[PDB]
Amino acid sequence: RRLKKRIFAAVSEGCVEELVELLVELQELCRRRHDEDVPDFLMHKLTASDTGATCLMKALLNINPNTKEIVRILLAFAEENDILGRFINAEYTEEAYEGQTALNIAIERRQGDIAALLIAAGADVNAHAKGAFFNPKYQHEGFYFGETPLALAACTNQPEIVQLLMEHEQTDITSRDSRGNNILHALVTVAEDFKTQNDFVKRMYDMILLRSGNWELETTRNNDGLTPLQLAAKMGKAEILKYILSREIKEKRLRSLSRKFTDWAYGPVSSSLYDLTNVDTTTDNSVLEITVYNTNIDNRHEMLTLEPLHTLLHMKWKKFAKHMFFLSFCFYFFYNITLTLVSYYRPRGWLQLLGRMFVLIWAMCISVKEGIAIFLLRPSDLQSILSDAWFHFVFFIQAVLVILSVFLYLFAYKEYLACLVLAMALGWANMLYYTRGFQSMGMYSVMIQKVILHDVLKFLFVYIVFLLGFGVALASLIEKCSSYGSFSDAVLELFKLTIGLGDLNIQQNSKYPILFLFLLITYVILTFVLLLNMLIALMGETVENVSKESERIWRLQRARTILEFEKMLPEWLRSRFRMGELRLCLRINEVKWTEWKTHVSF
Amino acid sequence: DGLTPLQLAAKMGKAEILKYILSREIKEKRLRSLSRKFTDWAYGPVSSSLYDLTNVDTTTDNSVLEITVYNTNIDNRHEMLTLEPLHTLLHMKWKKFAKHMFFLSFCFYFFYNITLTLVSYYRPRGWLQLLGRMFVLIWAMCISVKEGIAIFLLRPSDLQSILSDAWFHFVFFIQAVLVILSVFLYLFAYKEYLACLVLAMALGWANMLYY
Amino acid sequence: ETVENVSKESERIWRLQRARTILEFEKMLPEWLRSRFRMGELRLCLRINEVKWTEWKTHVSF
């Protein structure tokens, strides 16, 4: 009741003589045997009852210029009463830091010598700090480091303790923690995608993999089924991905770990074989399909520009995707030409039935294809971000409008013309999707979507309240017997007056003509001059901001087209795999006239 | 003037001395009551710390939050409103009780303007309008007296010089007095109530951009 | 020129207008219902907790 808090206050600040006198006094209080329990009474007088923290963690959490010898005499006292086997490896009891033993706090607080002192004293290294704070839901709620002391020494940039732990006998390196991660997935989750100056994590990954010297750390999957390569492609870290995909290590006994084998080099020309184990579309979930089909990252073009992704997409294009894209565009052009010629020569016999049937067949095909492609619209993050969720909707709406027009035409209903001309107008406005094949037209097909979604929806969501306010404030003072008779004619007159049409004549059948004229002049100064040109200043800002970022959007849209047309193929006709076994080992060759010349000029 | 060094450094707009004073961690004993932030525990990047809220709240009548928000004579007000314990204080003060009050005020003003629009559109060129005229008159008297108080406290006359929300008090008060003037001219024999009523309705629908 | 100069300075103006709305709605309350004060005595001592992933990583990387 009194010695426990006394020794807990004693261990904190570092009064050594008070500490050793209270430990020998605790030994005398232990000497009078109450014959209840040998270890539980010692734990009750040594560990706190609320948190679970022992005197060792309290010594380590509160470092001071006399912090080593208090741990040494405390371990000597633990060594004295035969308690050290269940004392130096004690964990928390609460479910917050549940598992955080003394070795983790020793490693985290940059105390390497105390860490080696505990590991030489018989500390456990396979401990798992599996508390909920250690594996939180997001990145901002807790410290995720893989809950092992080896990964904690690796992520906090202390390579001394990493070398000190890998040379130990018991420290299993491929130990998978609660999420499934080994040390390499934890190193990937800590790393930073932007090229910062001293990035320790690439060096740590390098030396840990070379110190292990086995393929096993590189290919174990976590609970989501992702290797470190697929995980670094998932999270969007371009530097670790660029290191892993092109890893050239030259000496013998570390050569099966390499992934790029340079075959021959001469000046700037170099031919090299890359490895394509998990970077293809052979398997169901790979680096190409991950780095193209993401939405949760921003540097997708920073990842799609490095080999063997760039040459893989070029070979995949010029082998079989260019002809499939131009063939799809030709079929959609003939479908829209046939729909236009049918809907223009409407009967106000035997020349239309051929001409109606191809339209109906291709409409049923397009509707069921988009029905499948929106049935797989499960993640609902593709809807949030601009990447090609819209065109599935518009193609499906045009197909169902065509088939609804045909089924209303074959019956006695004469409202088929509305559905048919909406189908034809939508079908000719959908041809801008096929302007992603060129380079100078992708910047013109993405601008429409960025400007409609960013600016014009905002300006219309403000302009509707001025339109409604002045519409009822003008229509309600017109005497019933000029043009402003109803609400829904005054709203049309104000819309005509906004876009430069319409008559701003004086004489409407009012009883207050000066008030009517003042409201009309105020509306024209608010929306013809102030609101409209402010919208055009905003649209200029959006178009300027997107036309300096057009080529990234075009490359990403082309890559998504590649992988969609590649998934469209059957299992046969995928006889276009890359290269025979060396492993797949795609052979590429490139010239680097900029790096060779600055490498030589020094 | 009744200002501590903390309130003075918030008044003059000096962000560096304010950032030093509000988060002052001194670690040795005998200089620990002078500290204002007590760091409770730290682990890697996660840190939990207790800050002090003596003169940084709205408990007293003149404090650092009320000074650094309600100023006009400075330019770096966002440089001061982004440091703790002001940022988390405004977030807690929002999500506890101010979000519901703001959305409730917006819903009441939307229903007041919908009722004013439906009354002023179906003008008689009986028993369906009197309910419909009376809620408009009650909420107009409430809004007019609220803005009358809020412009009665418009003493400094530097809030008029700088864009911060002196305009909307004027426009809300003008729309409220236009509504009550239209009602009092409608209950008499005057037929110039339509001018005041449609100016009130147009101003009431252009005032929804404040929300 | 004005719209370009204000749309690169919009988020400051929005944060300041939100803060003025907070303090106005807080002054609107009576003396009762200000049972939403921050934290009991240690002094008031608001407890906050934050992660600083940028300062920790550059502090560690040296």
Rg (CA), chain A: 36
Assign residue B44 a region: left if phi > 0, alpha if psi is -120 to 50, beta otherwise?
left
Find the DSSP H helices in B159-192: 167-186
Q: Where are the alpha helices (DSSP H) in A296-389?
A: 300-303, 310-316, 322-344, 353-375
Strands of A269-274's sheet, edge to edge?
A260-266, A269-274, A587-591
Residue for token digits 């040459």? Answer: A311
Whose CA is closest to A43, among A97, A1, A84? A84
Q: Is A256 exposed, middle or buried (0-12, 13-18, 19+ CB in 10 A)?
A: exposed
Amino acid at A541: E
The span from the CA of A268 to the CA of A282, in Å, is 32
Q: What are φ and ψ of residue A131, in 5° steps?
A: -75, 160
CB of A146 within 8 A of CB of A184? no
A500 is an annotated ligand-binding site residue: yes
Rounded to 5 degrees, φ, ψ at B42 are -140, 140
**Token digits of residue B55:** 């003169």
Residue type, B110: F
Burial class (CB in 10 A: 0-12, 13-18, 19+), B50: buried
C60 touches chain A (CB under 8 A): yes
Taking CB atoms and an 8 Å limit, are B46 and C46 in contact across chains?
A: no
What would the two tokens of residue A107 be?
Answer: 């490693």
The shortest CB-CB distance from C60 to any of A139, A140, A157 is to A157
Give the distance from residue A480's alpha carbon to the nearest chain B alpha carbon, in angstroms. 8
Residue A149 CA to residue A134 CA, distance in Å, equals: 13
- Long-range CB contacts (< 8 A, 24+ apart) of A413-420? A417/A346, A420/A343, A420/A346
Please count the CA atoms within 13 angstroms of the CA of A96 that sit on its side-chain side.
7
Q: Is A111 helix (H, G, I), strand (E, B) or coil?
A: coil
> How far, in Å, CA of A10 to CA of A16, rounded?
8
Residues of A in Cβ contact (< 8 Å) with C57: 192
Which candidate in B106, B192, B193, B198 is best for mutational testing of the A interface (most A CBs within 10 A)? Answer: B198
User: Residue A33: in which H helix or E strand, if any?
Assistant: none
User: For A213-276, where are the alpha helices, taking DSSP H only?
Assistant: 228-235, 238-245
User: Would you state the structure tokens that stand for residue C22, as one six-digit string?
Assistant: 């907070």
| Minimum-distance CB partner of B121 among A476, A479, A512 | A476
Nearest to A143 by CA among A112, A110, A186, A174: A186
Beta-carbon separation of A157 and C61 below 8 A: yes
Dist. CA A103–CA A486, nearest whole Å: 80
Terminal CA-to-CA distance of chain A, rounded, Å? 74
Q: Experimental method for this entry?
A: cryo-EM
**Are A117 and A71 in contact, with CB atoms under 8 Å apart?**
yes
Cα–Cα distance between A555 and A299 in angstroms, integer? 12
Computed on alpha carbons and rounded to an integer, the radius of gyration of chain C in Å comes to 19
End-to-end CA distance of chain B: 36
Q: Residues 6 or more apart from A198 whose CB is under 8 A from it?
A: C61, C62
Measure CA of the first residue to CA of the last residue in chain C; give whole Å: 44
Residue numbers in C near B81 (CB within 8 A): 15-16, 19
Burial C42-56 (b: 16+ CB within 10 A, else e): eebbbebeebeeeeb
Positive/negative CA dihedral, A313, A318, A320, A322? positive
Residue C6's closest chain A neighbor by CA? A538
Closest by CA to B58, choosing from B18, B100, B16, B86, is B86
Q: Which two tokens stand for residue A181?
A: 């991660």
Whether residues A541 and C60 touch (CB distance < 8 A) is answered with no
Q: Which residues of A touch B43 (CB under 8 A)?
A: 108, 143
Q: Determine the distance in angstroms separating the CA of C57 from the nearest CA of chain A, rounded to an integer.
A: 8
Q: Token match 């909420």: residue?
A: B139
Give the DSSP letter of residue A264.
E
- Look up residue A461 and give its two tokens: 């969501």
Q: Which pair of structure tokens corresponds to residue A210? A: 């070379």
What's phi and psi for A174, nearest 5 deg? -90, 30
